[PDB]
Amino acid sequence: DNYDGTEKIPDVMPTKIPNLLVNGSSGIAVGMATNIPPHNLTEVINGCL
DNA sequence: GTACCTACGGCTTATGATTCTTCTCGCTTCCGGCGGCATCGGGATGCCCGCGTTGCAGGCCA
């Protein structure tokens, strides 16, 4: 549900590509932080296979 | 239409403070350095013969 309980939001997306490993992100929490380099799609598919 | 502040977190870059390490001085005293004498073990020479050295040829090695 949305902020006022009037709409619906999908929890996760039915994706086919691991965008976390392909592009990544760089965010910082209140006490934590993360940083992930991008990668190549073909080698990720090869590793998954 | 046209810019100006910090919060949340991680790696660097610039500068001062601190302790570790090393450079340098301190005169003195004790360990050593040095001159002299009696001494005690040593070198060279006399001599001989037997072992060390060497010439020649044979078989073996790199």
From Swiss-Prot:
Transmembrane segments: none annotated. It is found in: Cytoplasm. When the enzyme transiently cleaves DNA a phosphotyrosine bond is formed between GyrA and DNA. In the presence of quinolones this intermediate can be trapped and is used as an indicator of drug toxicity. The enzyme-DNA intermediate is also the target of a number of topoisomerase poisons, including toxin CcdB. Few gyrases are as efficient as E.coli at forming negative supercoils. Not all organisms have 2 type II topoisomerases; in organisms with a single type II topoisomerase this enzyme also has to decatenate newly replicated chromosomes. Heterotetramer, composed of two GyrA and two GyrB chains. In the heterotetramer, GyrA contains the active site tyrosine that forms a transient covalent intermediate with the DNA, while GyrB binds cofactors and catalyzes ATP hydrolysis. Can form a 2:2 complex with toxin CcdB in which GyrA is inactive; rejuvenation of GyrA(2)CcdB(2) is effected by CcdA. Belongs to the type II topoisomerase GyrA/ParC subunit family. An N-terminal fragment (residues 1-523) can be reconstituted with GyrB, but the complex no longer has negative supercoiling or ATP-independent DNA relaxation activities, although it is capable of DNA cleavage; ATP-dependent relaxation is inhibited by novobiocin and non-hydrolyzable ATP analogs. The fragment has ATP-dependent DNA relaxation and 30-fold improved decatenation activities, unlike holoenzyme it preferentially binds supercoiled DNA. A type II topoisomerase that negatively supercoils closed circular double-stranded (ds) DNA in an ATP-dependent manner to maintain chromosomes in an underwound state. This makes better substrates for topoisomerase IV (ParC and ParE) which is the main enzyme that unlinks newly replicated chromosomes in E.coli. Gyrase catalyzes the interconversion of other topological isomers of dsDNA rings, including catenanes. Relaxes negatively supercoiled DNA in an ATP-independent manner. This is DNA gyrase subunit A. It comes from Escherichia coli (strain K12). The chain holds residues 147 to 195 of 875 of the full protein.
